[PDB]
Structures are given as C-alpha cells and as structure tokens.
Amino acid sequence: MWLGALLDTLPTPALTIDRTTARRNAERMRERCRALGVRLRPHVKTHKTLEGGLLATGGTRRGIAVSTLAEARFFADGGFDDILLAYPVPTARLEECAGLARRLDAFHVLLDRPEALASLRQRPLGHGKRWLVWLKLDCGRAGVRPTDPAALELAQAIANDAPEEVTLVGVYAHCGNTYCSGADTIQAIARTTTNAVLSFVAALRQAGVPCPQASIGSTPSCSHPIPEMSQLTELHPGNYIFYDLQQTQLGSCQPQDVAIRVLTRVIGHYAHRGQLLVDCGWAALSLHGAGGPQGCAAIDGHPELRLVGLTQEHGLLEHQMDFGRFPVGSVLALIPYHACATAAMHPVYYVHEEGKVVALWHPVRGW
Amino acid sequence: MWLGALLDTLPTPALTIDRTTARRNAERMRERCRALGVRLRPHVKTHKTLEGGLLATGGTRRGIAVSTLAEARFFADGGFDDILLAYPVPTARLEECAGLARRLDAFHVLLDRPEALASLRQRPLGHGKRWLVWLKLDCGRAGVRPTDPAALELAQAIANDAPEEVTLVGVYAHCGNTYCSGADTIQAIARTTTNAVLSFVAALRQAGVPCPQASIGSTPSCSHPIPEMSQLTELHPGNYIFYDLQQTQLGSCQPQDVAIRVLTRVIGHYAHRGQLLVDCGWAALSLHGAGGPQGCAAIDGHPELRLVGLTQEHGLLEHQMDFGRFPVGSVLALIPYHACATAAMHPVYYVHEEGKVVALWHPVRGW
Ligand SMILES: *Cc1c(COP(=O)(O)O)cnc(C)c1O
Ligand SMILES: *Cc1c(COP(=O)(O)O)cnc(C)c1O
Ligand SMILES: [Cl-]
Ligand SMILES: [Zn+2]
Ligand SMILES: [Zn+2]
C-alpha cells in the first residue's frame, strides 16, 4: 500500500497517472459530447480498470466499449452495464457472449458478416432477450463498406429477419485511420467517416431499415470534433483519458493533457559511452513508437535526453551528457508513445494528485 | 481449467508451450553444461514461471538468475534458492534485497560501480550473512570493462575490503551482443567474451583477488558452445527453454526446437483486400520483430501467409489468398519473434503434450 507516498518514493519503473489530468480529460470529453448533443461511450482498452471506467463514465458505470471478453466480464463483475463488445463477435465464444447478454440489461455485439448473424441465430439467447447487434462499418480493418450493397442487405437481415431473436441497435465505425498528423487531416478522416455513416443510415431509412443509433470515434477525431458529428447518436473514443506522446505529436492534445508517465530511476552512469542507465526496459514500456527506441518515449522536462536503447529491464539515455544533473538514484518521468500499449505492461497504476499517491488501479488483462 | 483439452479448443489468442519440446530444451542445455564441466544457472526471464524454473533446473529448484525483485520474491516464495539477481543491484531497494538475502541460503547480487558497493556497506545484512556479490563485466550495456584498471580495483574492494560484510563470488558477463547471425559470429562474440573474462580472472589471481566463479552466457552462445567455456564455472542462458523465430533466424536452433506458439483464430475474410483477420493483436504478441509487422511472427506450416498488420486485438494476414484453405474459425499457430516479449503479454501459458493441455503455467510480472 502506497497511499500518501511521494512519487519519487515509488518502486521503479512505475506507471503513474495524474488523477487531476485524467479527471479533466474525462470531463472534457463528456462536455464535448454534451455540446454536440451525443452520448459518450468511452472505450476502456487504454486502461482496462474499473476506476478509469468510473471516471470516463462520469460515475454512472453505464455505457462503455471493451476490446475483449476478459474486459466485458471484468466490467460486468464490477457492476457496469450497457457494455459493447467492440469487436467482430467471437462466434467460437458465443456461449460466453450469451452468458453476458443474459446477466446484463444491455450487452452489445458487433458484426460484419452474414455467417456471424447465422451463428447468432443458431445460438438464441432465450430468456426474453435479443442479441443487440451493431453493424460494423468500414469507412480499413474490419466491417462492411457502406457502399457495398452487401452492407445494406446485412443491415436489413440483422434488423428484420428475426426480430424476436436479434435486433439492429445501430451502425458502428472506428476511424482508426486518423493515426496522419494535424487537425485538418484528422478532421477530414472524421468527415469522410461521419458522412459515409450518415449516408448509410439515410440509405437504411429509405430502405425502411430501422437503425436507431450511429457511433463513431477515435481519440484524434473526438479531441477536435466537427459539427457533422452532432447528427450521430454516440462517440466512442478511449485513449483520451490518458493521452500519450503519439497523440501529442498528432496534435490531438497538448503535453499538459498527458496523464500517464513511466517513472524510472537512473541506475548507472557509463561515461565511456556518454549514457545514463535507467531501470525502465521494454517490459515496462513496450516497443511502441520504435517502428528506433528514441521514438518510444520522451523524458518529461528534459528535451536534451533521448532513449537510444531498451532491453527487457534496462534503458539507455543519451544527451555530451551532464552526469551531475542526473545522479544515480534520481527519478525521471518517461512520457510513453502509446498509452494503451504501455498500460498493458503494468499490473498496477499509481494514481496521484499534488505529488502524492491517492489510489492504486489494477487493470484486467488476457482474453 | 483446461487440462485434457485439445489445442483447437482453447480460447484464442492463446500462448501454448509444447512441454515435450520445452523439457527437451531444458535437458539439452543441462547436458551441454555437464559435457563442458560447468554448472547451469538458467535465467528465468523468458517464462517467469515456477514450472519453467523447475524444468530448467532439472527438478532441483536451485540455481537461477532473475531480472527483477518481483521474480526473486516469486521464486523464493516458490521454494527456490541460489537465486542471482542478474541486474545492477537496486540501491534504492536495498531493504528488499537484504530481506531476500536473509531468507535465502544464497541470494546473489551484481554490481559494477564503487558507489553501489558503498551502498551495500552502509546497509549491512547482519545475521551472520554476507552480501554475495558478482562483479558485472562489460566485454555493451552494464558492467565494467575488464581492461579498465577500475575493474580490477573494484573486484579487489568487493573481495577484501570488508570480508565480514561482503564477498566476491565471481565475475558475470552477458554476451547480449550475440543478438549478428550465424554460428561463426556468435561463437566469435562468445570467444571474445570468454577470453576477456578468463583474462580478467587470471589478472585477479595474479593480484591475489579471490574469484571462485565465472559466469557467462546468452542463448545463442550456449546453443553452440565453444571449448573455452569449460574454463568457466557456470553458464546462464534462459531463452533456450522456449526459443523463438529470432533464435531460429540467428541459427541458434531449428524450427523444431521452438516450444512456444500463439494460437489465433481466423475471425474474418476480407476479399476486397485479400486479407484474413485473426484474433491475435499486439496485446497477445508484442511488436518485437517489427523494427514491419511481418517480422513479428511466422505462421507455422504456412510460409504463404504473412502478418501485414497488428492492432491491439486484431491481426491481418495476407498470402492471392485462398479463403477455403482457412475457414473462419480455423486455428493457426503463430511463431513469435521474441519469446521473452510474447510471454510477457500472457497471464497463462497452455502447456501441452500430444495435442492436449497438460498444465497451465502462470507467470509473475511487475517489479
Ligand atoms: C480503440 C477503439 C476505440 C477507441 O479509439 P481510440 O482512438 O484509441 O480512443 C473505438 N472503437 C474501437 C473498435 C477501438 O478498437
Ligand atoms: C537475459 C539475460 C540472460 C539470459 O540470456 P538469453 O540470451 O536471453 O538466454 C543472462 N544474463 C542477463 C543479465 C540477462 O539479462
Ligand atoms: Cl512491444
Ligand atoms: Zn491505442
Ligand atoms: Zn529475450
């Protein structure tokens, strides 16, 4: 137990979350959605914690998206509901999906293939419940292309072919392609996606296919929303609760919006090479940002320094260095490239305010 | 509980370990060391499990190397002893190190700085125990260069300056630089390292510095050992228990020596792009091998296929494809680039023999 502890006191490497910053990020996204007239369904995959979920959800524990059944189960067990499995429904795991649909007032699934609908049909929920299905739109990884006649036909089938067993809740797009720098290009992807979705829904209405909801979002696009988004019903970003270096470089946020660090101690000086040795390796950071290591993290408040090497449990920093500025034992705060990836390496996050630990959040992991 | 289950039955993505292969790998390294007349101190960081430790150690639970205090504690609690913390000793965590030194018959630490020795001196163990110290030799990340006069002086200090509180057990080098392809260049690094170590120890003997042990090793060098190694006392490879694609490419092993897979299900076909969608993203694999994604894994038994994309929970495979060869629902076995990195993403390993799960191993993680 580390409650009350000063940050420089923590065992490193340590993932830290500034709760003032995270709370602010959570509330700001809630406000953007309120201003647009749309609901927020935060994706939880960046943190995978009940505590982060509670913040993102403004205390309601209702209305989230998850990336795995491990998360769906974990959040369900933590008293959340209105949980969307934002993943082509795992037809090999339908018994588990149906278990969740039966426990929850609203467990939502996505699909983009007729065979998946067929699988849902041959595993009815019973219990007076319907599979709550969203059609995933590809506007380029999963989903159906909205201009593909197949898309409209699949929507029709989801909506009307077995109204007693399955229902079409809405369409769902994830504009993951926003990960092009600049507000202008981000907003362009947002607009193509938004308009493609809106045009598809308009086609659905004309074809008499009821589609009450329409959900898009990624952190870049929801950090600089466009007015066209007010014609949707819901936005589902997730990374924004923490942000990270990549989002900062993308222009999604300012450095002050990044809640996450990895704290690391200088554990050695190697003058013959001009390097600091730190106790944060890829086990604490991941290699996200390297495709080299310089791209994986910046040192907060120290532009002079750069990561030049990562092994499992060690990192090497280079400036000509200044070894008196960085005694062995000093603590540096790394700003990670990708919060989701870095958070996935940590069994605990030390959540702080005013320099002191205020909470410990423990994420779920696995599948 | 999945004991007895057929592999195609597991929830994917699933890290699987062929126990016949792992056991064979464990026994083979033990035999190489026996043939050389040296001890084996397996490093556990590739698997971080008590079960893997028991295999590597030939059932003794004695004589391992670990990369973190989390591992030292976990293995100590699992009844292991003669545990070496193969890491410049964490002078900010000395109370924890001393706790371990006090519980264990033999907890070993490494250092390469006089200040670290000074820290050990100002935190005596008491209890009739001595800090068991190895001098880390850099023959290029941590350690002292053996030709650096400072090295000999630090060895002298460790050995003789407070014989009641601190003792020099031996010198420790990790020829991590073997990670240059080919047996010839691997063995060259092994030889430079081995000879540098042997020359340093010879210098120590001439200077009257007692140094009873001398430990080197990496998986590449211990997979093709050289006779000069018989002049050492111990070898400390670790990855070999599983091996991986990188070691296969390095020539350390044959494909048949790789015990580890990540099983993944085909979850979609996207003909308009010629791609299979699988349920293994970087959350199950890591991005090791990308610095792109094609380098992170091969598909076992399917040279035709290649990873072209990884998101957190999805992967994209490309051949012109053949969608009938790979129905949605089929299970493919990914051979990961770096076992250590992939294993760090999994809360459980499904260990199998003759196609069926035989054990579940749960690794420790964190710091
Ligand atoms: C990650 C994800 C989101 C949230 O996007 P971010 O840009 O990470 O905030 C929404 N939908 C899906 C399907 C996702 O995978
Ligand atoms: C990883 C490691 C080893 C084991 O080396 P492998 O090539 O991974 O088998 C030995 N010593 C140290 C210090 C290590 O970090
Ligand atoms: Cl990674
Ligand atoms: Zn992300
Ligand atoms: Zn490794």
UniProtKB/Swiss-Prot annotation, chains A, B:
Bilayer-spanning residue ranges: none
Summary of the tissues where the protein is detected: Expressed in kidney, specifically in the proximal tubule epithelial cells (at protein level). Expressed in the liver, specifically in hepatocytes (at protein level). Low expression levels in cerebellum, brain stem, midbrain and cerebrum (at protein level). In the cerebellum, expressed in Bergmann glial cells and astrocytes (at protein level). In the cerebrum, expressed in astrocytes (at protein level).
Known catalytic reactions: D-serine = pyruvate + NH4(+)
One Pfam match: Ala_racemase_N
Subcellular location(s) per record: Cytoplasm; Cell projection, Dendrite
Subunit-level organization: May form homo- or hetero- dimers.
Cofactor(s) annotated in UniProt: pyridoxal 5'-phosphate; Zn(2+)
Enzyme Commission code: 4.3.1.18
PANTHER family: D-SERINE DEHYDRATASE, ZGC:162816-RELATED
GO cellular component terms, semicolon-separated: cytoplasm; dendrite
One GO-annotated biological process of the protein: D-serine catabolic process
Superkingdom assignment: Eukaryota
Species of origin: Gallus gallus (Chicken)
CDD domains in the record: PLPDE_III_DSD
Ligand binding (Zn(2+)): H338, C340
Keywords assigned: Cell projection, Cytoplasm, Lyase, Metal-binding, Pyridoxal phosphate, Zinc
Regulation: Inhibited by hydroxylamine and aminooxyacetate.
Protein name, per record: D-serine dehydratase
Alphabetical list of InterPro entries matching this protein: Ala_racemase_N (IPR001608), D-amino_acid_metab_enzyme (IPR051466), D-ser_dehydrat-like_dom (IPR026956), D-ser_dehydrat-like_sf (IPR042208), PLP-binding_barrel (IPR029066)
Ligand binding (pyridoxal 5'-phosphate): Y172, Y179, T219, G238, N239
Similarity comment text for this entry: Belongs to the DSD1 family.
UniProt keyword ATP-binding, yes or no: no
Protein role: Catalyzes the conversion of D-serine, an allosteric activator of the N-methyl-D-aspartate (NMDA) receptor for L-glutamate, to pyruvate and ammonia.
Gene assigned in the entry: DSD
Modified residues (N6-(pyridoxal phosphate)lysine): K45
Major place of residence: cytoplasm
Leader sequence residues: none
pH-related activity note: Optimum pH is 8.5 (at 37 degrees Celsius).
